[PDB]
Amino acid sequence: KEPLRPRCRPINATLAVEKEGCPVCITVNTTICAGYCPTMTRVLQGVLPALPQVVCNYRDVRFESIRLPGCPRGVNPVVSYAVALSCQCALCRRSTTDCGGPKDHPLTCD
């Protein structure tokens, strides 16, 4: 069936692809990472460091690309998007990930 709270896994979604210079945003199909991760704040007061929250994240990324339509003269038209081979609950690595929270459906053209 469908877990109700399916744990962090690759899910199909559509990435909007855009490049400035090119007139058309192509919405490609790929796999993003989505699901649930077990997390829990300390009840015990006075501990350090702060137990950081694990988050749904990529594990094994393969890349694909497309050529955007209508680009001009010497603009490069091949934009590449990521494809989630696997996902995993892990530290939202701030150096490499933009760690935040919910946004009203972010992968649409714009």
Binding site: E20, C33, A34, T39, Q53, N57, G100
Partner: protein, 85 residues
């Protein structure tokens, strides 16, 4: 697999009979995707992936000392909220 709902749990190490220490523990939702170009033009440090999440956090708790020392807190209600840092 399926992950367990964010809900109160019995902290089995701070809980004494007649007086359980409750702890919010569970699963919430998070998604990770290639950061939108839109996002890229607003960030100073480009980061290739954008993570959106919520963590199992106490909507309400009670600062309470216990077992002699232990300054602990009693999670009274749970929810999927900010993962903070």
């Amino acid at each position: 697999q399926d992950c367990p709902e964010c809900t109160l749990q019995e902290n089995p190490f701070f809980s004494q009979p007649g007086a359980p220490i409750l702890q919010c523990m569970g699963c919430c939702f998070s998604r990770a995707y290639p950061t939108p170009l839109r996002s890229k033009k607003t960030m100073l440090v480009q980061k290739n992936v954008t993570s959106e999440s919520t963590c199992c956090v106490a909507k309400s708790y009670n600062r309470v000392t216990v077992m002699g020392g232990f300054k602990v807190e009693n999670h009274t209600a749970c929810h999927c909220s900010t993962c903070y840092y």
